[PDB]
RNA sequence: UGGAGAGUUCGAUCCUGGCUCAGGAUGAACGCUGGCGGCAUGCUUAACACAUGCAAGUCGGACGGGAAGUGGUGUUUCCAGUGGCGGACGGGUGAGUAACGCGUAAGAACCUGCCCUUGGGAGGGGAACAACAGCUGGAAACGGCUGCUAAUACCCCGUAGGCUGAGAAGCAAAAGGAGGAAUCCGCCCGAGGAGGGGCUCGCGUCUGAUUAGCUAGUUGGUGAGGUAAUAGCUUACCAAGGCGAUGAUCAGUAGCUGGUCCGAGAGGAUGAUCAGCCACACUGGGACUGAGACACGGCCCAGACUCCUACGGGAGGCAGCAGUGGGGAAUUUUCCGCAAUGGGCGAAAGCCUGACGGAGCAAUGCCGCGUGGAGGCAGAAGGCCCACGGGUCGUGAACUUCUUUUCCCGGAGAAGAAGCAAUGACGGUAUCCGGGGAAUAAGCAUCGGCUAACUCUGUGCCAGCAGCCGCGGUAAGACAGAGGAUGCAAGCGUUAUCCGGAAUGAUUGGGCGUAAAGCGUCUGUAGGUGGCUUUUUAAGUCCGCCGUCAAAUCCCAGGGCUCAACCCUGGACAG
C-alpha cells in the first residue's frame, strides 16, 4: 500500500471517465435520420454481407449503426431510432437499431423473439 | 470564548501583528496527525509584541474585516531565528 | 362574456399611494 | 409571531395530524422548533403534553381553534 | 401471477422429493427416462432446485418470498429457522394443517372467498401472519357447504401437528406457539436456501 | 448477525494482468403484452417562447357615502374612493454561486409587524384632500384645471421616564371606535420575553499546477462620513503591506445539507420526490414604500421580442395551477371543493385561498389480490420425437361435482365536523348483505459454457446470432421454425446510468530482482520520525457529565388500515 503520509500529499482519486457509447446526457435511446445505407465486410474469423447505416443524430454527430435480422426497409430519408450496443466483429460500429419503431419496420414471419426485433403477435 | 496560541511572523504593519497558529489534529478517515497552519491578523494598540513572541489569541469585537482577534497575554519571550 | 360597464385593475393605484408616502 | 395548532404528515384518508411550535410566516407542513403532542381522529389515542403547554403560552403564543377543544376534552383547562 | 396456475404434478416429479400440491401421485419423473441414473448436478443446481421446492410447496411467488427471507435475516435469532416461521404463519398454510382443505392451492381460494374467521373478524388476505393464541375458525354461513363438511369428516381420526390443536365438533383450531426445527416434516434443507440469496 | 464466483491471453502449467458476465438500484425510455385495488411518483432535454381562466384579498364595530340586492319605510348589506393590514406568507425554479452560499461549533458591535409581561400617558388645535361636481386634452393608455368634504390621512402646540451629555441641563409621542348604567378593542413612549432576520470567527466543502504567482483602497493605522449594527462599507492622509505549495490567482464544472443508491464494513456514486438553508424569477441596472422584500403576479429606465394604434403614442412576459407551440427516448385532467388543516383580513359571522384537501390520465415503482377450485382417464383427438415395439405434451383438455374474492348489477352504509339554524369536495366512499355465472382477465425472456432448461427439420460461413469465450463452408442443443423444457410474472425483455464483483489505487485490502514499478548517485531546507531517567505540564489521548447534533429516513420493540406497501409511539443512533 502507498504510505499514509504520501496519501495526504497526493491523495488517490479516479479520472473524468470515458463512455462506451456517447448517447449524450445519459439518454437511453436517441433519434436520427439515416444518411447512407451501405453493406460492409466483417473481421478475420467471419465473412458475410452485413447491413450497416450511418445515422445522423439530433446533436449533429454521424455515427454508424447495425441493423439486426433478415430483411429491412431503410432508405436515404428514413427517420430511425438507435439503441446503444457493440457488435464486436465490425470495426467502428458501436450502435444497434431498434426495429418496429418510427420508420423502421419489424421482421416478417418471425415467431421467436417478439420483444426484440419489433414483431407483432400473429393470430 | 475560544483561545488559540501561536508565534508572530510579521511585525512591519501599523498596530497589527501576524500570528501563525499551529494545530495538530487526527484524520477521521485515516489515523495519523495532519498539521494545519493558518495566520491570524491580531490587534495590538500598544505595539509591545514584536516578531518572534508566542502569544495567545481570544475572540473580540471586529476592528476591521480581516481582524477579529486580540492578543491579551504572553507565555514566553523571543523564539525566532538569529540575526 | 364581457361586462356592460367599463373596468380596469389599476396597478398605478399602488404606485400613486407609494409616491404619496414618499 | 408563534402559535399552536397541528400539521400534516399522514396523507390520503389517514390524516394523523402532527405536533406544534411554528411561526405564522412559515409553511403548513414545514419547520417545527419544539415538540409537544398530537391526536388521532379515528382512534382513542390522545396525547397533548401538559408541561409543554402553559410554558409556551406565557411568552406570546396564540391558542387557535384546533389546539382548543382537544385541550378541554382532557383534564387541562377548567376552573381549577 | 399470484400463485402458479396450470401443471401442478410436474414439480412433484423431476425434483426427487414428493410435496403436497394435490394428494398423492407417483415417484417417477417426466419423459421416457428419469427412472434411471440422472446426470451429475452442479453446486449451483442444489441451491436453485431446493429453493424452488420451498417456493412451490406453499404456492408463493418470488416477489413475496424475497421479503419473508430478508426481514427474517434482519431479525434476531437463528435465520435458517425463522424463514419457516413467517412462511408457516400464512393463513393459506395453517388452513391445510387444520384439515379444512385437502391442499394448499385450494386453501388460498377458501380464504379469498370469505370462509374463514380470525378472532371473530373476517380476513380475506392469505399472506396474513397468524400470531399465537388466535382462533382460526369457519363462518356460520359457510358451515353448511359440502366441501367443508367432507374435508372435516376425515379429520377426527388423523393426528394434526403438535403446534396446533383442533376440536372436531365446533370446527375451530387454535395456534398455541411457534413451529421449531423437529416439528417441521418437509424434505427441504434450510441451509441451502439462505445461501442462494447471498451470492 | 456481516464479506460464495466464473470465462478468456498458452501445447499445457503456475503467476501477473486487462477485459467480460451473474446482483441490486434508477424521479427512466423502447419492444411485446396487459385484470384490478392500496400508497407513492411524474420536462431529469429549451430558465425556451407562451392563447385563455385562475393563483390576494379582506375590513364601514377607521371614514365622506350608497351605484347593486333584501326589509322597513331606512336597517342589514355593500359597487367605487380615503384609510388600516397583508401583496417581502404560501407556490415555483436552480440559472447563478465552490463562494464568510451551505453544514458543524463558537462570538459580538444589532434590528425586529402581528403576540405577550410591566409602568406612564392618551390634553388641546390647524390646514388640505380623493370620492363627488362643473368643464377639459386624447384612438387608447393615462389624465389636466377649479370647487366642496370626513376619518385610527397629515402637520403643529402642550406634556414627558427615554435619548444626547462628565454634569448641569437640552429635547421628541398620540386615534379613536363599538355593546352596554362605564366593558372590550385599539393608539403613543420606554424597559423586557418570544420568534424571525442581519453581522463575526474557525474546520470541513469538486477537478486541472503541462493555471505560480496574485493584490492599490490592495492590507493595515489615524480622523471625519455612513448603516439597525461591527467594519475600508466610505473619503482624505500616513505606513506598505496583505494572500500562496497545509497550493492563492486563473480556467472548466456545480446549488448546499438532512439524506438517497450500492456495499459486510470502509468506501464509492449522488442528492428526484419530503424537509432546512441559499439564490433567481423576460434580460441588465436602480431606487421607493415598509418592521421586514431594492420585493413572481410592485414601480421606474434601457434592451430583445409579442400585441394594439385615428403611428402622435402605448400594453405585457406562467422558474404559480391547468394547459399551447417547440425540443426531446420520455413525463398527465385548461377537473371538484373550503368540507377538513393552514395562510390573509375581521371583537365575529364570513370572505379570499389550483397552499392544500381530492378526483382524472400513465402498469413509473413498491405492496396485496385475482384470472378458477377438487375430482378425471390407463393416459382421448390433434402436434413433436420414434430404433416406429412407443413415448411425450397430459390431467393438460374434454367430461364431471364445487366455490365464486376482484370486475358487473341491486339494497344498506363507519369515519375523517371540531365547530355546533346540525356543517363535506372526495362518494352511485370504505365496508357490509344479496343475485347470474367461471362466467370477463397472461405473457415475456431463455435453453453451448458462466445461466437454471432439449431434440427434430430447414439453411448451410449463405442468411443470421453475439455480454465474453465464440457459433454457420450438409446431419451446427450457441442461425431460422416446431415440439418440449426452464425462469419470471401482468409483468417480462432490451438499453441507458451508479455501485458491487475490481484487496485492478488496496485507510480497513495490494505491490516495485525478472511480470507495470527506487528516481544515475550524494548533500540538504521545510516536512515526517526520534535512545534512556526523574519531576512537571497535560495539549493529544482517555473517563464522566452538561449543551448541540432539527424533523422525517435507517435500526430495535410495540400499535392502526382485513395483510402488506403505507401510517404511527418510545427508544436507539446521529460515529
PDB file of N, CA and C (backbone and C1' of nucleotides) in Angstrom, chain F residues 10-24:
ATOM      1  P     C F  10      -4.130 -18.138 -25.901  1.00  0.00           P
ATOM      2  O5'   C F  10      -2.553 -18.238 -26.101  1.00  0.00           O
ATOM      3  C5'   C F  10      -1.967 -19.438 -26.596  1.00  0.00           C
ATOM      4  C4'   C F  10      -0.850 -19.893 -25.690  1.00  0.00           C
ATOM      5  C3'   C F  10      -0.498 -21.365 -25.838  1.00  0.00           C
ATOM      6  O3'   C F  10       0.452 -21.551 -26.885  1.00  0.00           O
ATOM      7  C1'   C F  10      -0.815 -20.848 -23.547  1.00  0.00           C
ATOM      8  P     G F  11       0.037 -22.381 -28.201  1.00  0.00           P
ATOM      9  O5'   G F  11      -0.154 -23.871 -27.672  1.00  0.00           O
ATOM     10  C5'   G F  11      -0.998 -24.799 -28.355  1.00  0.00           C
ATOM     11  C4'   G F  11      -1.066 -26.097 -27.587  1.00  0.00           C
ATOM     12  C3'   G F  11      -1.398 -25.938 -26.111  1.00  0.00           C
ATOM     13  O3'   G F  11      -2.806 -25.919 -25.905  1.00  0.00           O
ATOM     14  C1'   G F  11       0.544 -27.257 -26.328  1.00  0.00           C
ATOM     15  P     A F  12      -3.450 -24.827 -24.917  1.00  0.00           P
ATOM     16  O5'   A F  12      -3.057 -25.347 -23.462  1.00  0.00           O
ATOM     17  C5'   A F  12      -3.530 -26.607 -22.992  1.00  0.00           C
ATOM     18  C4'   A F  12      -2.597 -27.168 -21.943  1.00  0.00           C
ATOM     19  C3'   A F  12      -2.412 -26.341 -20.681  1.00  0.00           C
ATOM     20  O3'   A F  12      -3.471 -26.570 -19.755  1.00  0.00           O
ATOM     21  C1'   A F  12      -0.304 -27.074 -21.455  1.00  0.00           C
ATOM     22  P     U F  13      -3.734 -25.518 -18.567  1.00  0.00           P
ATOM     23  O5'   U F  13      -2.383 -25.549 -17.722  1.00  0.00           O
ATOM     24  C5'   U F  13      -2.013 -26.714 -16.991  1.00  0.00           C
ATOM     25  C4'   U F  13      -0.901 -26.405 -16.020  1.00  0.00           C
ATOM     26  C3'   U F  13      -1.101 -25.165 -15.168  1.00  0.00           C
ATOM     27  O3'   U F  13      -1.936 -25.460 -14.054  1.00  0.00           O
ATOM     28  C1'   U F  13       1.104 -25.194 -16.032  1.00  0.00           C
ATOM     29  P     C F  14      -2.906 -24.324 -13.461  1.00  0.00           P
ATOM     30  O5'   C F  14      -1.929 -23.423 -12.584  1.00  0.00           O
ATOM     31  C5'   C F  14      -1.209 -23.984 -11.490  1.00  0.00           C
ATOM     32  C4'   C F  14      -0.042 -23.102 -11.120  1.00  0.00           C
ATOM     33  C3'   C F  14      -0.377 -21.640 -10.876  1.00  0.00           C
ATOM     34  O3'   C F  14      -0.878 -21.428  -9.561  1.00  0.00           O
ATOM     35  C1'   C F  14       1.522 -21.783 -12.273  1.00  0.00           C
ATOM     36  P     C F  15      -1.671 -20.072  -9.227  1.00  0.00           P
ATOM     37  O5'   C F  15      -0.549 -18.951  -9.365  1.00  0.00           O
ATOM     38  C5'   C F  15      -0.895 -17.586  -9.544  1.00  0.00           C
ATOM     39  C4'   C F  15       0.349 -16.761  -9.755  1.00  0.00           C
ATOM     40  C3'   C F  15       0.096 -15.307 -10.110  1.00  0.00           C
ATOM     41  O3'   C F  15      -0.069 -14.539  -8.923  1.00  0.00           O
ATOM     42  C1'   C F  15       1.658 -16.229 -11.628  1.00  0.00           C
ATOM     43  P     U F  16      -1.228 -13.430  -8.844  1.00  0.00           P
ATOM     44  O5'   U F  16      -0.718 -12.284  -9.824  1.00  0.00           O
ATOM     45  C5'   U F  16       0.513 -11.606  -9.579  1.00  0.00           C
ATOM     46  C4'   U F  16       0.936 -10.835 -10.806  1.00  0.00           C
ATOM     47  C3'   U F  16      -0.134  -9.928 -11.392  1.00  0.00           C
ATOM     48  O3'   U F  16      -0.151  -8.671 -10.724  1.00  0.00           O
ATOM     49  C1'   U F  16       0.832 -11.222 -13.119  1.00  0.00           C
ATOM     50  P     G F  17      -1.556  -7.956 -10.415  1.00  0.00           P
ATOM     51  O5'   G F  17      -2.149  -7.646 -11.861  1.00  0.00           O
ATOM     52  C5'   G F  17      -1.464  -6.776 -12.758  1.00  0.00           C
ATOM     53  C4'   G F  17      -2.065  -6.867 -14.141  1.00  0.00           C
ATOM     54  C3'   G F  17      -3.570  -6.677 -14.223  1.00  0.00           C
ATOM     55  O3'   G F  17      -3.918  -5.296 -14.226  1.00  0.00           O
ATOM     56  C1'   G F  17      -2.950  -8.563 -15.502  1.00  0.00           C
ATOM     57  P     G F  18      -5.383  -4.840 -13.743  1.00  0.00           P
ATOM     58  O5'   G F  18      -6.207  -4.718 -15.100  1.00  0.00           O
ATOM     59  C5'   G F  18      -5.858  -3.742 -16.077  1.00  0.00           C
ATOM     60  C4'   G F  18      -6.437  -4.108 -17.424  1.00  0.00           C
ATOM     61  C3'   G F  18      -7.939  -4.333 -17.473  1.00  0.00           C
ATOM     62  O3'   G F  18      -8.641  -3.099 -17.594  1.00  0.00           O
ATOM     63  C1'   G F  18      -6.844  -6.074 -18.639  1.00  0.00           C
ATOM     64  P     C F  19     -10.195  -3.023 -17.183  1.00  0.00           P
ATOM     65  O5'   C F  19     -10.925  -3.946 -18.259  1.00  0.00           O
ATOM     66  C5'   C F  19     -10.931  -3.595 -19.642  1.00  0.00           C
ATOM     67  C4'   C F  19     -11.485  -4.731 -20.472  1.00  0.00           C
ATOM     68  C3'   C F  19     -12.861  -5.237 -20.069  1.00  0.00           C
ATOM     69  O3'   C F  19     -13.890  -4.433 -20.634  1.00  0.00           O
ATOM     70  C1'   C F  19     -11.413  -7.077 -20.389  1.00  0.00           C
ATOM     71  P     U F  20     -15.308  -4.315 -19.885  1.00  0.00           P
ATOM     72  O5'   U F  20     -15.904  -5.790 -19.966  1.00  0.00           O
ATOM     73  C5'   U F  20     -16.358  -6.329 -21.206  1.00  0.00           C
ATOM     74  C4'   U F  20     -16.963  -7.699 -20.996  1.00  0.00           C
ATOM     75  C3'   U F  20     -17.997  -7.805 -19.887  1.00  0.00           C
ATOM     76  O3'   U F  20     -19.277  -7.373 -20.335  1.00  0.00           O
ATOM     77  C1'   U F  20     -16.476  -9.611 -19.727  1.00  0.00           C
ATOM     78  P     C F  21     -20.374  -6.882 -19.266  1.00  0.00           P
ATOM     79  O5'   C F  21     -20.927  -8.239 -18.641  1.00  0.00           O
ATOM     80  C5'   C F  21     -21.619  -9.186 -19.451  1.00  0.00           C
ATOM     81  C4'   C F  21     -21.842 -10.471 -18.688  1.00  0.00           C
ATOM     82  C3'   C F  21     -22.532 -10.334 -17.340  1.00  0.00           C
ATOM     83  O3'   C F  21     -23.946 -10.281 -17.503  1.00  0.00           O
ATOM     84  C1'   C F  21     -20.645 -11.748 -17.127  1.00  0.00           C
ATOM     85  P     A F  22     -24.860  -9.645 -16.343  1.00  0.00           P
ATOM     86  O5'   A F  22     -24.949 -10.802 -15.251  1.00  0.00           O
ATOM     87  C5'   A F  22     -25.601 -12.037 -15.543  1.00  0.00           C
ATOM     88  C4'   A F  22     -25.574 -12.945 -14.335  1.00  0.00           C
ATOM     89  C3'   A F  22     -26.105 -12.337 -13.047  1.00  0.00           C
ATOM     90  O3'   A F  22     -27.522 -12.458 -12.974  1.00  0.00           O
ATOM     91  C1'   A F  22     -24.038 -13.408 -12.622  1.00  0.00           C
ATOM     92  P     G F  23     -28.417 -11.163 -12.642  1.00  0.00           P
ATOM     93  O5'   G F  23     -27.863 -10.656 -11.237  1.00  0.00           O
ATOM     94  C5'   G F  23     -27.981 -11.461 -10.066  1.00  0.00           C
ATOM     95  C4'   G F  23     -27.809 -10.614  -8.827  1.00  0.00           C
ATOM     96  C3'   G F  23     -28.722  -9.401  -8.730  1.00  0.00           C
ATOM     97  O3'   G F  23     -29.993  -9.752  -8.193  1.00  0.00           O
ATOM     98  C1'   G F  23     -26.502  -8.743  -8.267  1.00  0.00           C
ATOM     99  P     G F  24     -31.291  -8.881  -8.580  1.00  0.00           P
ATOM    100  O5'   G F  24     -31.071  -7.504  -7.810  1.00  0.00           O
ATOM    101  C5'   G F  24     -31.072  -7.455  -6.385  1.00  0.00           C
ATOM    102  C4'   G F  24     -30.589  -6.108  -5.899  1.00  0.00           C
ATOM    103  C3'   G F  24     -31.331  -4.891  -6.432  1.00  0.00           C
ATOM    104  O3'   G F  24     -32.522  -4.642  -5.690  1.00  0.00           O
ATOM    105  C1'   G F  24     -29.000  -4.515  -6.566  1.00  0.00           C
TER     106        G F  24
END
